[model samples]
Target: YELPEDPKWEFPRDKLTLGKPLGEGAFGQVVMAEAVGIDKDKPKEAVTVAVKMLKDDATEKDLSDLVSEMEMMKMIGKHKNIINLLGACTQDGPLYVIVEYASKGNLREYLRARRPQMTFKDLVSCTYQLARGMEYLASQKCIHRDLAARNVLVTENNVMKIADFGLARDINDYYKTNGRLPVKWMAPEALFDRVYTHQSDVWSFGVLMWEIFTLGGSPYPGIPVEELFKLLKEGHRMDKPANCTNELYMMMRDCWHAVPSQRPTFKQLVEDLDRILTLT
Candidate 1:
C-alpha cells in the first residue's frame, strides 16, 4: 500500500509494452506503449500509454531529480486539463515514465495543418481549455516554466492538455537555469534574473496566444534571438497577428506586463477567455 523512498516510485517493467516512437525532444523520446495491470481498481484492463525513457548516458542524479519531480506531480493528483501520469519504472537501468497517450499529438501540429479552416470560435475554445488547465496548475502552486503550443498535447477529441513537465517547478524549488531556456516565451524577469513564477508562465501563455492566433506561426520571426532581450527591454512586443481581434490583442498585452505582479492570473485568464468565447 505504501510507496518506497529509495526508488521513490515503481512500476513493473514487464507490464509495460513499448511500441514505436511517438516523438523525441530534448528530454527524451516518447514511445507508444500499453501498460498491463496499471489500474489497481481494475487490474485486468490494459492502459494505453506513452513511455518517455531517459537516454543511456543520463546521469544517476538526472534520474534521481526526474523521479523526485514525478513523485511531486503524483502528490498533486490528477486534473483533466493536465496529462495524467499512469506510473513510472525506475528500478531498472533506464528511467521510464508512463503517461496517458494523447492520440492527436502536440497542439502545434494540429493547428498548423488546420489553420486556414480554424474558426475564431475554435481558437477561443482552445485558448479557454488551455487556460483552464493552467488555472488548475496554478491552483496546485505549480509553475509550468516551459508553456508553449508545442508543449501542449491534443487528444483525439481535440481536448488540449498541458504536457512536457521537464521544465516545470514547484513553488519552493525556485532554482535558476544555467542552460538555454525558451527566450521567446519567457517573461522579462525570468529572462534576466532566472527567477520563474506562475506569472512567468502567464507571460508564456501570452506568447502561446500569439502562436494560436497565427496558427502555429513562429513568434518574432524576423528578430534575431540575441536581439529579443533588447527588444523586450525597449517596450517592443509582437505585432497582433492578421485577423486577431483588438480585444484579444489587448488581453495578450495585459499578460506581457513588465511587472510580473501586473500580469493577469490564470484564473483571470480563464474568465476572460470564457467571456470572449460567448461574445464571439
Candidate 2:
C-alpha cells in the first residue's frame, strides 16, 4: 500500500501508534491510534485517532484507488457531521489514513444495539444531523454513491458522522457500476439503467431512514434480487415501518419516486427534518 513518490499527503510515521482494531473491511482495517505531536511545535500533545491501513494482500490498484479517495476527503476538508481526516502516512510500508475516532462506532450498529430504547426525538435529531451532513456534501458537489446507515459513524455523544467515501464521486461524474451495487439501497434508475446522481444518493438516504425506523431491518426482506428489478420497475417499495411517522414515511416515498428529479434535495430534506425535529 505504499504511496507514489512525493505524495501530496504524507504524515510522520513516528508520530502515530496503532492500537486495537476498530473494524475490518475488504480494502483495509481501521484501528484506534494515538497521534503524538503531529505539529512540530507541539511535542507533548497527543490526539486519539482512527487509522485505516491497507491490508497486506491488497493489490496496486487497490492502493492507488484508496489514495485517490484520501485525496478526495482532503479536498472536502472539515464538516462537523462528516468524519474529519486528520492526516496520512506515506513514508513507507502500508498507507495509513488517520481520522477522528468515533467512540460509539458506526451508526447502523449503534441503532441495531439500542433501537428498542431510542426515543422518537433522538431518532429525529440523529436523522436531521445526517441530513445536514449530506447537505454539506451536496453543497460541495460531492455525490456519496453509498449513503446507507452502515457507512455512517456515531459518536459517544450521539453525533452522527457520514463516512466511507470509497464510492463517492464528483456530482458531474456519471457513476455507473454493474459489478457490485447495493440493490436494496440503490435508487431504481441506478439499479436498472446504471445512472447515478445526487438523486440516487437521496434514494439511499430514504432507505437509511427506513433502517432507522425499523431498527436496522433488512431493506427488502423476503424480496429476492432477481425479482427486485421487476418489483421496483412496477413501483413496489418497502412498506412503512411501524415506528415511522406519516410525514417521515411520505418523505421516504418521495425519495423513491421513479423520476430522479422528483426527489428532494438534501438541503430541502434538512429544512423539512428541522421543522419535524422542532415538533418532536
Candidate 3:
C-alpha cells in the first residue's frame, strides 16, 4: 500500500503504554511500547517501538520537523535494513512517531558498555550490517545525512540497521542543495556547503568505519570539537591507527580524500566491504 502523506499518529489522548525507558535526548523521550497494530491479535504482542512524543510547547520548526519525520518514516516503512514503523500515538494531543523495537539497543551505548578488548571479527560483522543498511539506503536514493553509532540499532543476533530518519532526505529532492553538512564526518566539499552529492556521504561513511573500529570513540580523541574543526581547516585528517586492517584502513582513507571526486560510491563500498568481510 502507498504510505500516508499526513501525520497518522494521534496525540496525548492515545494510551501510550510505556515499557522500559530506552533513551533520552533534547527533542523528547523514547520508550518501548506494547504493539498496537490494527490487528486485534497483535495488539498485546510485545513489539519494540521508539515513541518520540513532542512537547506541548514546541517551536514552529520543531513541530515542522516532527511532521517531516512522520512523513519520512511512512515513506521508508518496512525496509529490511531500515527500522520498521508499526504504528503511532493516535491521540489528539502531543505528537509522537512509533518505530520498531531493537532490543540490542543503540550501537553507541552498546559499544560504550562493551569491554575494551574486542575481536576484529565482531567489529567486521557490525560493519557489514551497517554497510548493508547503507547500501539499501543508497538504492532508495536516500541519504542518512547524520549516520552515527547512536543512530544505528543492534538486534539480538548482533545484526545492525540504520534508524532515526529525522535527518534523512531524498538525494533527488531539491532541498538537498541546502541540507546541513555535518562537517565532522562530512566530505571536504560538503564542509564548505558547496552542495553535497552521494560522494559526500561516502566520506562520512569512512569516518563511521573508524568510529565503529574504535568502539564508538570520539572522531578525534582528546581534540576538542572546536580544535577538530581547526585541524580540518588546516588540512589535517584522521590518521589510521596501526591495528586497523590495512585494506579497511586504506579504503577509509580514500573515503576522506581531499577531493570529493576521489571518494567511492556506496555501491562500490558494498562490493569492497563484502570482500573485506570475507577475508576477515
Candidate 4:
C-alpha cells in the first residue's frame, strides 16, 4: 500500500531550513526547523516546525518504518489534541518528516517542572482533552502502542497534543533489540504476548493518569520489572495517588482490567470524566 499524499503536506528540502537538534530516539533524530511559505500561500511566511530524520546508520527497515508512520499520521488527519504533520522530503536521501512544534515540550516534563502545583481542574482538563484525542484515534481503529505522558506534548497555549505516532513501526523486534520496551505503560496482554489493541492504549492511559496525579512519579517505583508481572498476575495495581479523587482513581482501575474486553473505551472515559467534573 502506498502512503497517501496531499499538496498541503508536500514540501521541498529547499524550503526547509534545519536548525538545532531536538533529540534522537525511537522516532529517529528530531531537529528544530523553519518552513518557508508554510501558511496560506504566502511565500515569505515562515513557521517553526520539528523535522524527524533517519540517522546515517539507519537501515532500509527504518526507512519503511518512517514512511509507515507518515502514512499512519496522514490517515489520522487532524485533531486539536494530536500533532499535525506538515509534510516530508522522502524522494531524496536524508529524508525529512516535518510536523507541528509543540513548544512546551512533553506533558511529563511539564508536570514535573510544576511539582503538581496545578489544581485538579487544570490537571483533569488535560486528561479530558487527552481522552477526546484518544477517542478520536480509537474511532479510526488506530492503536497507539505508545501512549505515556512523555509521548504527550504540551503547546505554548497549554493545550495537549498526542505525539510519536509509531503505528507503522513494529514494536516487537525493535524492543527486543534496543531495550526500548515500555513495561510500565504496557498492558498485560501486550507485555506477556505481542497483542496490542486500542484497549492496550487504554491501559497505558491508566498509567499515564497515575503519572499525572503523582506529578510524574514513575509507576511502581522500587519494584523490579520481573515482579511487576508477578504482581500484575496476582491482581496488584498502583494505589491511588495521594489526594486524587477515588472517582478518578477508579477510572484508572477500570482501564487496568485484566480482560482487555472489559476496559472502558476512551469514548466512555470521556463521558465519565464529564460527570466526575460535574459532581465536585
Candidate 5:
C-alpha cells in the first residue's frame, strides 16, 4: 500500500483529471487530461496529457485488448520518434492510459493543412524521422503491423511520434487476425495471406511516404476497396502522384516487392532515407 521501491508507470488516479475529448472508439474515448507529478525522472512536472480510457459499456474483450496494449508498451519502452506512455491508472476499475500530448496534432492533418507551404525537404524530414522510429521498433523485434500517417502525430519542432499502432505484435510471434485493416497501407502479403512482418510495416511505410508526399491524398482514388484488393493480388500498385520524384518512387517500389523476404528492412530504410536527406 505504501511503496514497492521504484514502481512502474502506475499513475496515481487522484492526480489525473479528464478534459475535452480528442477522439473516441468502440472500447473507449481518448481525451485531454492534466496530470500531476508525471515526469518522475525529470522535474516531476505537472503536464498536459492524452488519456485513453475504457468506456462504461466496454466488454471483457475490450478490457483484454487494453491490457494487451499496456503490456506491449512495457516491451516497447521508449523511443524518441515514438509516443511516450507517461503513465497509466491501471490499479483502478476504469483504466486510464496517459500518453504525451502532441500539441501540433495528427501528422496526416498537419501535412494536409501545411501542404501549400511545405517543401520537399519538409516531407523528407518527416519520412526520415518515421524511418528512424520504425528502425527502433525493428531493433526490438516489434512489428507495428499497421503503420500510416494518420496513426502518427506531429509534436513540437515538427517531430513525428508514432501514435496508434493498429495491432502491435512481437516478431517472435506474428500478427493480428483482425479485419478492418488499412488495406491501402498493407503489403501484398499482408492483404493476401493475412501475414505480417517487419517488411509488411516497411510496405506500409512506403504508403505513408506517399501520403506525406501527396499531402494526404487518398490512395487508389475512386477505386472500391474490393477492386483495391483484387488488383494488389494481381501485383498492381499506384503510380507516382503528380510531382513525385523517381528516386522516391523507386523506394516505394522496393518496399512493394511481391516477395516479403526480399523487401528492404527498416535498417536499410533508415540509411536510404538518411542518404536521401544528406544528398538534398
Candidate 6:
C-alpha cells in the first residue's frame, strides 16, 4: 500500500497503492493506503491511513461536498487530535482525499465490536479523548458539525480521536436562518439554519454522548426520522438515559437546549469531562 507518488504530487491510485475496500457510501468508497516516504515527521506511526475515492457519476452536490471537505480539512489541519490531511488529487478524473487512517476504524464499528456493554468509566475515558479533540478544534475556531459515535475513532491503545470534517464549517461565516441542515442528532437551531454557533455543535455533542454511552443507539429511539423532525419542529427532545448518573444525564441535557446560548462551549465541556471521569 506504499504510495510511490512523489510527495509533491498526490496520485492516490497510481502513486499510493490502494488496498481492500474499507467501506462505501453515497459519497464514495474508502480504501486503505500506506503513505510511504510522504513525510519523515509522521510516517505510519500509530495509525493506518486511507484514501477516499469518489465514484465516476458523482453529482454536482457530491463534488461540492468533496471540495468543502478539502477546504474544511485545510482550514483545520494542524490540530493534533483532529484527523490531518495527507494530500488530494483534483488534477485527475476521480477526485480523491488522502487522509490520516484511523487504524481502529470509526466509532460505529468499534462500538459494535465491544462485547456486552460499554461501562460509564469506559465512556468517560473515550469522552475525555473526544472532548480533548473538540477542545482543540474549538480553540482553532472550528466546529465539528457532526459528533456521533460513528465520527469518533478508538485507536489500538483504547485512545479516541475525532475524524470526518465533511460537514464542518467556520462559525464566522453566516448562513440563512431558514435553511435546512441534517437532522437526527443536530441541534434545533441548526435544523432551522438559525445561526449555528459553537453551542449548536455542543448540542450535537450531547446527543453523541448519549450514543456513545449506549454503544451506538439511535437518537430519539422511539421516533422515526420524519416524525422526529416534525416533533423537533414542535420542540421535542430525547429523554435522559435511565442508567446514567444525574451529572452525566445533566451533561447530556445541556447539549439539547432550545437556546444555543445556554449550551456549553467545547472548552467548558472538556473541563467537565475531565472532572466527571475522575469520579467513581
Best by TM-score: 2
- Candidate 5 structure quality by residue, lDDT tens digits, 127-220: 9999999999988888887788888998877889987753888776457455667888988877778777788898898888888889987788
Residues 22-122 of candidate 3: C-alpha lDDT, one tens digit per residue: 77665666777765443336654454466776655667776677767777776664666678665555444455677767888888878778845567888
| lDDT against true structure, model 4 | 0.82
Model 1, C-alpha of 38: deviation from truth (Å)? 1.9
* Off by more than 4 A, model 2: 5-8, 39-43, 172-177
What's the lDDT for residue 112 in model 5? 85
Q: What is the lDDT of candidate 5?
A: 0.82
Worst 10 residues of 1 by lDDT: 1-10
Give candidate 5 regions above 4 Å deviation.
Answer: 1-6, 173-178
Ranking by TM-score: 2, 5, 1, 4, 6, 3
Candidate 3 displacement at residue 177 in angstroms: 5.5
User: Candidate 2's residue-wise lDDT over 138-235, tens digit each?
Assistant: 88888888888998998878799999888888763556655466778888878878888888889999999999888777888998888988989999
All models, RMSD in angstroms: 2.9, 2.0, 3.9, 4.0, 2.9, 4.2
TM-score of each: 0.91, 0.93, 0.85, 0.88, 0.92, 0.85
TM-score of 3: 0.85
Instruction: Indicate the TM-score of model 2.
Output: 0.93
What number of clashing residue pairs does each candidate have, in the order they appear?
0, 0, 7, 0, 0, 3
Displacement of residue 144 (Cα, Å) in model 6 is: 2.6
User: Total backbone clashes of model 6?
Assistant: 3
Task: For model 3, state the Cα shift of residue 274 in Å.
Answer: 1.3
Model 6: residue 219 alpha-carbon error in angstroms? 0.8
Best by lDDT: 2
* lDDT, residue 184, model 4: 90
- Of candidate 2, the 10-residue stretch with the lowest lDDT total is 1-10
